[PDB]
Paper text:
[name] encodes an enzyme belonging to the aminopeptidases P (APPro) family (E.C.3.4.11.9), a type of metalloprotease that catalyzes the removal of the N-terminal residue from a polypeptide that has proline as the second residue. It is one of the critical virulence-associated genes identified using a [name]-C. elegans infection mode. In contrast to other metalloaminopeptidases, APPro is a cytoplasmic aminopeptidase and recognizes a restricted scissile Xaa-Pro bond of those polypeptide or protein substrates that may be linked to virulence-associated phenotypes or other biological processes beyond the general protein degradation ability. In this study, we solved the X-ray crystal structure of Pa-[name] with a resolution of 1.8 Å.
Author numbering:
A (entry chain D): 1 to 444
B (entry chain B): 1 to 449
C (entry chain C), D (entry chain A): 1 to 442
The structure:
């Protein structure tokens, strides 16, 4: 269905090689497999960088890019075809599949890599790889180099330089292509439908996990292999726990529900947070806190455009929230003073957003040249201001305590401004209450 | 939601300590956490042995059992309360919760383990732990021992014996208590409802993942934190792959669907397989294979009772399937000869079941004294015969190729034979077709269920 | 049938905490269970105070209210779910039921209360509870406090103040909400029908228990789990015994029958007394005493309104009954003098009413600031004057001896007066005789 | 009414004293009174042992038997006559009643017991009483002994032996006299009529308590002061709850109704269970389970006779029910192995009966000399097999789930067999359906 096309992976290989120095080689392993318990495996997730360059879904693989190589620049080591093992575990691409389906120029059994990779590294000046990212692989690499070190007298010369690959490759990933935006847009649409379903099913007497079930249900019907991250479904006081994950508490009349969840499609994330009343009607205190957050959400979009700096959106949300907290009497004093003294962090103690991509907290440098990154079209990020009044915050009136609200949207920088991908699930008080009322009467 | 009660964890601790030799100590770590991608963690799953003795859900904890320690036989190292960390990741039990909620005699911050545990090990004759299970922990233990070794000046004596804990503990786990059976019944019931919904929703044009959605939906509505294992949803020829997990193929009219899936509840597994026609009606070839597997399934139960040995169920399914394959003309010859030469393995190449429990493939010794284990009440296992005609099997008529069937139930040995936990989801041809037809009809009428 | 809704119990919880001093805690146990004989239990009745705040019907439970508590102000300790026991004894709510169905913020097994409750008491300034109501609980509480002081060196501080919860909570119960009046209306209606049936079935030759049978039958068909109190069915001279309960005498021609009986619904009482002739016809002497009691009954309602004080209705019934007794010749002299010397107590020796609510003789202070409480809307009470002439009272003519009469209604105070809940069973001589006559064929 | 005659109580006292060793004394207190809520008391129920020996209905009494005492062997402490209290409370027998209608040789006000009883105990070798049965009485006895011991210097000799009265007295109660059988027979007849009325009135749309209303109605019309136990009226899946007492569910078409209920008369129990279809027609599955329980019920009687031991009836019901479950396919295997390994307990998890008498689970030793008690004429017991299929029992076909059936009768061992007292309410499918059909039409 919606996916990155085979040719785009080739294009990305080309773009990385075009930034490598001549006579160099880049090497990337696939992600490891993990055992969840005894012999039951965790769901497999390909490494984002390796996936970005190959689209190859299997474990036990290593790729090499060798610019200018006569027989072909892209080499893949992967599992061999094995009829007995594939009877149990599923089909393998094999070396023919790697060349044919996945576009490799040459492909070799993963079991033979020790007998082959050293020869390909021999004679190159630089090796590009993710130093420190996978220490097990880093040791494997040093062994291959030591093999070259033995023949030095045969005139085998090992490379003299190791260069950090993530610096270059993550900067590529920071600029989303049209097809990437397309996949993220689709993921966002699936996630928006999921959040709506959670709003429509919610009633007092259910548990937090009932709403998580609705989310996973819609995620998977959309084709998601897994969420972009563990879903947060936090009722009542639990909404003040930023990464609450118990998802096991009974839902009570009068609770707010905070839901931070998003699917992933073809290894591209979506990330949405909505907050809504469990009983379908915001109390006056809930409504006031919610609409303040919504004001900060809406203000942040005005500071996301080409030429704006990364932090401008966050700073806008700080201004809005601090001013609102003063208006409500939850903070006393001068807004500029309170910001300088960071008094708002009693209520809003996290950043307004992060890069979004193949990892939900995506790669890419937030600072360049001792300055905040300048935004350019194709960059994608979240906007997620929040307010959390702890249940034990004695400095505020009792009716405010235990209220947590976050409103998060996914956005892409465009030439003239930005594009919001998550408008498909509403966020005004009116639309939310309308949506929940309609579902309530349909069910009855 | 059903769960093991606090008192049962204490009884298990006592039973284990009653088997340990005097002046010994047992040590178990919690399961590690794994990064899934970048800074996104995998869903956390407590180590089954650690969970079995503590019920403690947090990572970075270590438990110790010290029989006869006057100060308290059960010691738990765990995270301490940290307000900034909890604002983000959630509340922690802390040392006070460990003693109070989880019944520990003493509790210490996990950060202090290096300064406390060597002293508890010192003077003990034996340390019981899971040799080789957690290499990182094995390294920690050797450090603690080296620490004791270096206090000979003060007269410290390291233990000289290290005993594999799994021998005693996994035999305890093999005998399910009444409370354990109650949790497993509930898990099986939840899984049964999930399999039914998959059947009711299936139609050509959907994808395999649409059915997996229904499974996860029902699992989680029943309280499951996760499946017992990654769900297998295999349409058509994919059913001939025993652990198919791509789950991404479009369903075609005429396909069979094989679903192997089960939730887990409070870390106790359920494991069900059902096969059904994607269009609601078994073809004649599909029905012929299906009824033969069903015959094997039913026959296996007759050999599960106190006094029977473990392999008897599997042999019965081998006789039934081999005899039936000859009957249908898929094999040729004498049934007894075909079994002796394993000719059936071209169609039925796996075992008829496994222990069932906190791990799907549960712990417990299948052979004692070189012979197959004798069954006793409380032992739990699966029954899962199957037949798989590979798509490229040229030794049989083309109409049979690409057909795969497995029918799996969960059972517990009782004083009177066994108890099947998974009858909640039907397995005869009539019931399956009736179930699917009813749902199609109700859906056409826009009735809600 | 009708019942207090879940939200009202929460409203009452909130109202009580609004009056507790800050950093305090209130604790309430459920009622105990009693063995009737060998291993047969008595019917279970929840403690009215505990029920009033929780609606929770189970024994072996304790509630706690902790104002301002960050993780929830309402904690309930109750029984754990148990498959083997529930197979015999019936379903239990458990901790999940306590949170979901009954609205607890937190819930713990009753078996762990010793490990949890002391920690919740620790650091509180003040503990509200019903001193002396449950001595076993009082003892239990002292143990919990001892756990706190044993940790005194660590900075664990026991509370320094214990406050009688009855003062606050029973004053709450004294003012009936709209939902409470609705329940009490229904219970009164059921009891009215029961009284009618007893009148319609009565005839000489039956026994008192035959009439008690009709009462219990109608009570239970209306949903009552138990009467509000042991029914009194007193024939003839038994009507001169105020708390007659033998209910085993044969009804004789010429007997009066006095019936004091009412059901309770969702732990709310009704309380009705009617007197009537066994043979359907008041004798001249019976009628004379009866209509005098009825005059007192009717007069009392005129002194039940906001602004009046509690004892005014009683005083009115005293004036009416003494005056009538003189007029009929059973007393002799000046009415005001007779009242000063309580000469009427030879015939009318109890008070004209009591508060009415979750207990038949309901809670609530009759005197405030050394004087009779001023009535306010929402208060509920009974009106039950009577006259009882002992069979052996030689100071009056023989024709009066052995006559006992009481006429009791239930009343709620309103904005401008009162509402009588029990008009559904008649009390005039004419209506009563007509009722019994009409039933004859049937 | 039917009741134990005053001569029989005297006989019982003589029989007990004839089993006491010389120069001893036996002491039994009345049952305590309980408060139900606030000042409302629970219905009073005399202690069965005290009742059995005295017939005396009041609380606040203590009896003493002093064999061979010249001034009178039977002494009763009880409330003294008090006119003011009687005016409110009810009439008291007083000391006049005690020596009068109740036949005491001597009688004293209970207020003076501390000044008289020790003198009666002093000089006796043994004291017979019910160790541990009434802890309040126990400490009172220890005080009375201590006051004697304080006089040891001045010649007083306190008894040195204290003997469990239960063992002698409960063995007497196990053999029912002719009059006791007459009383139980009547109680069973009353309960029979009550069960019939429940069947006749039942219809979908009623609630369980409407049927309990019919039971209490008929009980009380027969003279019962209380049921022998709280009535169980269990509709639908509630029938699998062996002592279900919520009695508050709506009755649905297709439900079975299980009613376990019985009145007591003069403190003698009856105990009947019948199961019947709410709609008057047993479904095929309901019928098959019902008929199997009925076969077990009828079979039990063949093993109740003198010389049979107590458990033979129960063993018969186990045998019959297991075979029938095999025949129906709810169990699979060899019947004898299924019996030996108790496979039936998944469906039939209680005993087939109990002694029956003044307490519904009556006193008496089930085992003598490490063996089951041999039956003798005069012993009384119940027969109550049942089968219960939980709604979620997936080891059986769906059509059986949620069916609960129990069929209970009361029985007296006779010289050649047993006598069933509860035949007055039918139990065959035909008679039940006919009974319900006739009532619906009329
Ligand atoms: O969950 C949150 O609120 C913050 C947003 C930035 C990353 N984590
Ligand atoms: O190992 C076994 O017994 C089964 C066969 C298929 C999946 N697991
Ligand atoms: O308390 C009262 O007022 C009434 C008088 C008769 C019985 N109770
Ligand atoms: O528990 C008891 O004593 C009886 C036996 C059957 C059901 N009720
Ligand atoms: Ca237990
Ligand atoms: Ca309600
Ligand atoms: Ca607090
Ligand atoms: Ca006689
Ligand atoms: Ca055995
Ligand atoms: Mn988020
Ligand atoms: Mn996030
Ligand atoms: Mn985010
Ligand atoms: Mn399986
Ligand atoms: Mn399996
Ligand atoms: Mn499996
Ligand atoms: Mn009254
Ligand atoms: Mn009254
Ligand atoms: Mn009264
Ligand atoms: Mn019985
Ligand atoms: Mn019974
Ligand atoms: Mn009974
Ligand atoms: Na527990
Ligand atoms: Na279908
Ligand atoms: Na006349
Ligand atoms: Na006994």
């Amino acid at each position: 269905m919606i996916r990155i096309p085979k040719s785009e992976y080739a294009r990305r290989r080309k773009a990385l090689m075009a930034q490598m120095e001549p006579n160099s080689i880049a090497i990337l392993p696939a992600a490891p497999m993990y055992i969840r318990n005894r012999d039951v495996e965790h769901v497999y997730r390909q490494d984002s960088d390796f996936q970005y360059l190959t689209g190859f879904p299997e474990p036990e693989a290593v790729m090499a890019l060798i610019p200018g190589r006569a027989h072909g620049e892209y080499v893949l080591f992967c599992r061999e075809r094995d009829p007995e093992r594939e009877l149990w575990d599923g089909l393998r691409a094999g070396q023919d599949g790697a060349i044919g389906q996945y576009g490799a120029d040459d492909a070799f059994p993963i079991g033979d890599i020790d007998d082959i990779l050293p020869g390909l590294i021999e004679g190159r000046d630089r090796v590009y790889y993710a130093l420190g990212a996978n220490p097990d692989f880093d040791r494997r690499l040093m062994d291959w180099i030591n093999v070259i070190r033995s023949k030095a007298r045969q005139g085998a010369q090992p490379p003299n330089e190791f260069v950090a690959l993530d610096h270059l490759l993550h900067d590529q990933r920071l600029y989303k292509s049209a097809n990437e935006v397309k996949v993220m847009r689709y993921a966002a649409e699936v996630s928006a439908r999921a959040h709506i379903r959670a709003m429509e099913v919610c009633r007092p007497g259910l548990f937090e996990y009932h709403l998580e079930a609705e989310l996973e249900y819609e995620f998977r019907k959309g084709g998601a292999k897994m969420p972009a991250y563990g879903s947060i479904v936090a009722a009542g006081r639990n909404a003040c726990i930023l990464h609450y994950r118990e998802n096991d508490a009974a839902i009570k009349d009068g609770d707010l529900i905070l839901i931070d969840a998003g699917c992933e499609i073809d290894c591209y994330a979506s990330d949405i947070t909505r907050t809504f009343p469990a009983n379908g009607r915001f109390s006056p205190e809930q409504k006031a806190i919610y609409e303040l957050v919504l004001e900060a959400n809406m203000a942040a979009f005005d500071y996301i455009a080409p030429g704006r700096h990364w932090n401008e959106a966050h700073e806008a949300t700080v201004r809005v929230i601090t001013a609102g907290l003063v208006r409500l009497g939850l903070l006393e004093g001068d807004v500029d003073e309170l910001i300088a003294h960071e008094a708002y962090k009693a209520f809003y103690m996290h950043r307004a957003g992060h890069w979004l991509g193949m990892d939900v907290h995506d790669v890419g440098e937030y600072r360049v040249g001792g300055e905040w990154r300048v935004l350019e079209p194709g960059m994608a990020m979240t906007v997620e201001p929040g307010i959390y009044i702890a249940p034990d915050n004695t400095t505020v009136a009792k009716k405010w305590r235990g209220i947590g609200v976050r409103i998060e949207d996914d956005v892409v920088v465009t030439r003239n401004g930005c594009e919001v991908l998550t408008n498909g699930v509403p966020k005004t008080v009116a639309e939310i209450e309308a949506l929940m009322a309609a579902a309530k009467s349909e069910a009855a």
